[PDB]
Design a protein around this ligand. Sequence first.
Ligand code: CL
Ligand code: CL
Ligand code: CL
Ligand code: CL
Ligand code: CL
Ligand code: CL
Ligand code: ZN
Ligand code: ZN
Ligand code: ZN
Ligand code: ZN
Lengths: 110, 112, 110, 112
Amino acid sequence: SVNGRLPELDFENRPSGAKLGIFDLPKLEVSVAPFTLAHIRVPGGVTTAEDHHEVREIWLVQSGSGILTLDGVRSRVRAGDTLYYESYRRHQLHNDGDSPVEIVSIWWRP
Amino acid sequence: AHSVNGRLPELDFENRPSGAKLGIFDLPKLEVSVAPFTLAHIRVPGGVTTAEDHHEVREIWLVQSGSGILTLDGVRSRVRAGDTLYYESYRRHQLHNDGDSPVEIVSIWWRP
Amino acid sequence: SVNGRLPELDFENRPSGAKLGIFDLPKLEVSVAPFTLAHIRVPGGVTTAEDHHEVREIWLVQSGSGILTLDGVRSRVRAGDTLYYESYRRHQLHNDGDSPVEIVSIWWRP
Amino acid sequence: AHSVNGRLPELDFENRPSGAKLGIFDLPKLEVSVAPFTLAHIRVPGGVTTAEDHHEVREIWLVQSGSGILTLDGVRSRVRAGDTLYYESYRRHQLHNDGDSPVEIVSIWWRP
Ligand SMILES: [Cl-]
Ligand SMILES: [Cl-]
Ligand SMILES: [Cl-]
Ligand SMILES: [Cl-]
Ligand SMILES: [Cl-]
Ligand SMILES: [Cl-]
Ligand SMILES: [Zn+2]
Ligand SMILES: [Zn+2]
Ligand SMILES: [Zn+2]
Ligand SMILES: [Zn+2]
């Protein structure tokens, strides 16, 4: 740790006569999934903060309808639309309906 | 919610300054290596023939010392120090050290 | 390819005096996502085939209701439930309603 | 569906023998390495000091030949052939070869 060395190899003697040593690297706690799964609820009248991030992102719009602004281009989305945002694309959703927009969001590091 | 139904817990929603709400699904956790590969050293003494390998992980061999005869999908070829090999998934490989010196290999394996 | 050798290294001379050679590995076409995203529609009366696979899997049940059998244990799921299936758990869904069960499925290699 | 709305195409559903229907979302594709890491050789001639590195990728150094003085987050230490080092993300590292021989390193880097 202080100088970052890995422990010395413990070699296994294999039946063939070969020797095999596996490097013992640090462990860490991770999610079973290589992505983050979330739900976004946008009430009526809400505009989300303009998002931009290196993680890639998918939106599965489940309910409601809104004006997506994607890199300056406005378009309407609704329940049943599915969207993919490449790294760093600027996205923002304005819900101009009475009922909430419900979104399943998935994001992951490229 | 439990392992018997596989059901994930109810979401806890956070309020964002915009008025939107964000809930993150709480998935199960796991202890894994800091590395998405396995790093290994293989030493093949003089006269040894490794076991014929046939596995799903991709594999890189950085041959460091010595020399021997790689058999790769039935094709015989010589490999020596400074060679670097890449074995696509499920390719049969087997090394016979016909020298007197050990062949030393840094091996990297990972799931496609 | 015939003997699997990588091409010889092309070393770059760095301003420090060090040399850096990067190994040129084979390329391949992949999805931008490290998982597969799908939709499963189970009509009324349908029972899905008993699934089992090494990939991990999440179901986001969007609509309808059914009897999940998970490793021999029966339970009811509905729209709004979200499920995680570890590698090799046996899952199967019977839709005993009039209307279809709609599921967003995500699977990925552990 | 296009890049201007980011919208994915409508699903094409397949009938399964059970009566269920399966549609797979068609996501965009990309050319990547067969390996989830970058594999490199670093050669530090006698007297050379590498640039101080400070980056997000994790890094493994398999020192093969020679010897020098690693500086790791301001701590000076000697590294020699046969040493294997692991640099967690954003750890400052810099190698000074105070010998006459080159230090040769197999370096592996990857995104946490
Ligand atoms: Cl927001
Ligand atoms: Cl709606
Ligand atoms: Cl063996
Ligand atoms: Cl089925
Ligand atoms: Cl429903
Ligand atoms: Cl440098
Ligand atoms: Zn976002
Ligand atoms: Zn092997
Ligand atoms: Zn399944
Ligand atoms: Zn570095």
